[PDB]
Amino acid sequence: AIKTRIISDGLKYSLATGNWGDARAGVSQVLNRLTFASTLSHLRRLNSPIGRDGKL
Amino acid sequence: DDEEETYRLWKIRKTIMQLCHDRGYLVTQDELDQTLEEFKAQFGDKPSEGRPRRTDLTVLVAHNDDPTDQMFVFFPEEPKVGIKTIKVYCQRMQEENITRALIVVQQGMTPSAKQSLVDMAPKYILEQFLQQELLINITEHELVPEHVVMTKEEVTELLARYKLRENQLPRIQAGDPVARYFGIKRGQVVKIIRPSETAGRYITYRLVQ
Amino acid sequence: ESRGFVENSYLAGLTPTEFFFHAMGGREGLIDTAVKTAETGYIQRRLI
DNA sequence: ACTAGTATGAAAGTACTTGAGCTTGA
DNA sequence: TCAAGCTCAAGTACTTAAGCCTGGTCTATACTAGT
């Protein structure tokens, strides 16, 4: 009755792809490992949900 | 108000005199620029149900050559003109032998009468103008350059010199307020002299479409 | 000093409130530079 | 069972169409 | 006085939003015969 792919493959898809759903994208980004400063700055990053290319 | 009305009627009279003179008519020189006080003396200083009422100052002018054609200008009493009002003017025109005329409407025309004006255009031509169009001679404005209607011989000379057709000239609307001022019909090239800051003078041409 | 006037120079350096107000003015400049580009390029495309 | 194949908030502006109101004609 | 026609205004729907370039990661799931 309990199939395990619907609860594990969904988490794996939403973290591996970043398409946050089956909605928005870019939630889980690949970690930036050029510099330890870049690694720290990628783990402390906030994203405004406002979309891009706005003239305001 | 009554002084405001005689001022407004005098400015419409002045602009119609300048319109007839720029269109190429017999306009008497003192009539072409009279004083407001001269208008008040000649007509009576009370447009509010008095002596300078409408239909007293219907200006009849003839042409500077070929003095047969005339456009004896109309001033309706009512604000909103209609067909049963313009057919009285049609009766006054068919009493005559002359086909051009100008009516000066106060408010807007009923659009059935707008269609009616086009409904006798090969027979006899009627132009209409609102009061706000004739409180300012727009050819005196500094943005408006010198428009001159060209004769058909000059159009043939133009197209034969530049080896181009009437399809190729830059064009102008028929409902253009300067085109309405000169009363030009479709297909009638208008030379336009304007000062240019890079050559001095530039004469462009506007065929009417 | 409360409303954003910076009385220090870049040789002396800014106090933290003046640093933050200066960062606000700079963010306004970068927003102008980043938003200008697409609209100016589209005006150029329409004109050509 | 079970397995693989099968099937489905924080755009802006312009133009066109529809509805309502006003005027004219019968 | 009523009906029809024409014009104007309002509401709704459709089309576009920089130029080039370099990297990466990841790509269905549910089911039903068909053994």
UniProtKB/Swiss-Prot annotation, chain C:
Region of interest (Bridging helix), ranges: 15-48
PTM characteristics: The tandem heptapeptide repeats in the C-terminal domain (CTD) can be highly phosphorylated. The phosphorylation activates Pol II. Phosphorylation occurs mainly at residues 'Ser-2' and 'Ser-5' of the heptapeptide repeat and is mediated, at least, by CDK7 and CDK9. POLR2A associated with DNA is specifically phosphorylated at 'Ser-5' of the CTD by CDK7, promoting transcription initiation by triggering dissociation from DNA. Phosphorylated at 'Ser-2', Ser-5' and 'Ser-7' of the CTD by CDK9 (P-TEFb complex), promoting transcription elongation. Among tandem heptapeptide repeats of the C-terminal domain (CTD) some do not match the Y-S-P-T-S-P-S consensus, the seventh serine residue 'Ser-7' being replaced by a lysine. 'Lys-7' in these non-consensus heptapeptide repeats can be alternatively acetylated, methylated and dimethylated. EP300 is one of the enzyme able to acetylate 'Lys-7'. Acetylation at 'Lys-7' of non-consensus heptapeptide repeats is associated with 'Ser-2' phosphorylation and active transcription. Regulates initiation or early elongation steps of transcription specially for inducible genes.
Location of this chain's protein in the cell: Nucleus; Cytoplasm; Chromosome
Domain-level remarks: The C-terminal domain (CTD) serves as a platform for assembly of factors that regulate transcription initiation, elongation, termination and mRNA processing.
Subunit structure and binding partners: Component of the RNA polymerase II (Pol II) core complex consisting of 12 subunits: a ten-subunit catalytic core composed of POLR2A/RPB1, POLR2B/RPB2, POLR2C/RPB3, POLR2I/RPB9, POLR2J/RPB11, POLR2E/RPABC1, POLR2F/RPABC2, POLR2H/RPABC3, POLR2K/RPABC4 and POLR2L/RPABC5 and a mobile stalk composed of two subunits POLR2D/RPB4 and POLR2G/RPB7, protruding from the core and functioning primarily in transcription initiation. Part of Pol II(G) complex, in which Pol II core associates with an additional subunit POLR2M; unlike conventional Pol II, Pol II(G) functions as a transcriptional repressor.
Family per record: Belongs to the RNA polymerase beta' chain family.
Function: Catalytic core component of RNA polymerase II (Pol II), a DNA-dependent RNA polymerase which synthesizes mRNA precursors and many functional non-coding RNAs using the four ribonucleoside triphosphates as substrates. Pol II-mediated transcription cycle proceeds through transcription initiation, transcription elongation and transcription termination stages. RNA-dependent RNA polymerase that catalyzes the extension of a non-coding RNA (ncRNA) at the 3'-end using the four ribonucleoside triphosphates as substrates. An internal ncRNA sequence near the 3'-end serves as a template in a single-round Pol II-mediated RNA polymerization reaction. May decrease the stability of ncRNAs that repress Pol II-mediated gene transcription.
The protein's name in its UniProt record: DNA-directed RNA polymerase II subunit RPB1
Name of encoding gene: POLR2A
Span within the parent record: 818 to 865 of 1970
